[PDB]
Amino acid sequence: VPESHRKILADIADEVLEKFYGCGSTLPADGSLEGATVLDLGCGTGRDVYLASKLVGEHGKVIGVDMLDNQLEVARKYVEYHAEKFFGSPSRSNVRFLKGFIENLATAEPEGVPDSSVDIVISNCVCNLSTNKLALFKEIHRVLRDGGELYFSDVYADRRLSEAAQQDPILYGECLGGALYLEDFRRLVAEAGFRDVRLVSVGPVDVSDPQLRKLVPDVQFYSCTFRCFKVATLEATREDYGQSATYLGGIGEEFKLDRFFTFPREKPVRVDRNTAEIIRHSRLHQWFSVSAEQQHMGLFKANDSYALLHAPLSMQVEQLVS
Numbered sequence: 001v002p003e004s005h006r007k008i009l010a011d012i013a014d015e016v017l018e019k020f021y022g023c024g025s026t027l028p029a030d031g032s033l034e035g036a037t038v039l040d041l042g043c044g045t046g047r048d049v050y051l052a053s054k055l056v057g058e059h060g061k062v063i064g065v066d067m068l069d070n071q072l073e074v075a076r077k078y079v080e081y082h083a084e085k086f087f088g089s090p091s092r093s094n095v096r097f098l099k100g101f102i103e104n105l106a107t108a109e110p111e112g113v114p115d116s117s118v119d120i121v122i123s124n125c126v127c128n129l130s131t132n133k134l135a136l137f138k139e140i141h142r143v144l145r146d147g148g149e150l151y152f153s154d155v156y157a158d159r160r161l162s163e164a165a166q167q168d169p170i171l172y173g174e175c176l177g178g179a180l181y182l183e184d185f186r187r188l189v190a191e192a193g194f195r196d197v198r199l200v201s202v203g204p205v206d207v208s209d210p211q212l213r214k215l216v217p218d219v220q221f222y223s224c225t226f227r228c229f230k231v232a233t234l235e236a237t238r239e240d241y242g243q244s245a246t247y248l249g250g251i252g253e254e255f256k257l258d259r260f261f262t263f264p265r266e267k268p269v270r271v272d273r274n275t276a277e278i279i280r281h282s283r284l285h286q287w288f289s290v291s292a293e294q295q296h297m298g299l300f301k302a303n304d305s306y307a308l309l310h311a312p313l314s315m316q317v318e319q320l321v322s
């Protein structure tokens, strides 16, 4: 738990913390959250929705979605509580909780999530129990506005699991059985409309039970945090148009977009055009200066890890854990 969140969680209702299902949804840098609309898929009792509530401030909004009756009941009891806590009045809530399958946000209750209405979709470990990943990714793409991002953590595999592993109920409940191979994930999310997957962080996930490991003997599992922007002008490849981006300051000493691009305050950093377009069309533009496109210069190589930048996801992930 990041320090900047600790004081806010101390202010969140003990019943929300005590009954919360799962691990916290990871968030983009606090400063970038100001005024955003955030949607948490599988919000549980609302721990992350309330944390985001504060971080987005009074001009932001947070929406939580879940299908667990008891979780939501708890969530919905503390709306006034946290409005008082954060904003000073019980009537000043910027959160709402909706009941529904994450696969179809359009028909949640009391209301659905409309097209192009969300800046950030967050979630932690929801995909491998999803009933239909493609449909889930398509629904995320639908609700995001242009320049919005899916910023999420989940478990992935370095190879395709066997049928036997995919049928095992303990592997399934542990979010391993339903894990995609990293390249299959890349193709699936691209079919849903996310043409550029950026690796934020990765940790190893171990299967130590020797019985279960026999179903996935040499499989390496990872918990990966990815950010996938919805930006109309993204291409499948990372092309150089001679651009630089300069982080202007104001949401930290430096801005780390992903494991390839770190932007120190007031220093120009060469960027491929996808990265430029992400900065320009997303909410991040507020804190950046991005130079004009020149003539195409070929594949983007002005990065000290440009080889890995263009490589398959499995190589990026495997090398970042090293």
Ligand SMILES: [As]
Pocket (backbone or CB within 6 Å): 124, 125, 126, 174, 175
């Ligand atoms: As999970």
Ligand SMILES: [Ca+2]
Pocket (backbone or CB within 6 Å): 021, 022, 023, 024, 025, 041, 042, 043, 044, 123, 124
């Ligand atoms: Ca959750």
Ligand SMILES: [Ca+2]
Pocket (backbone or CB within 6 Å): 158, 220, 318
């Ligand atoms: Ca491997």
Ligand SMILES: [Cl-]
Pocket (backbone or CB within 6 Å): 125, 173, 174, 175
């Ligand atoms: Cl899990």
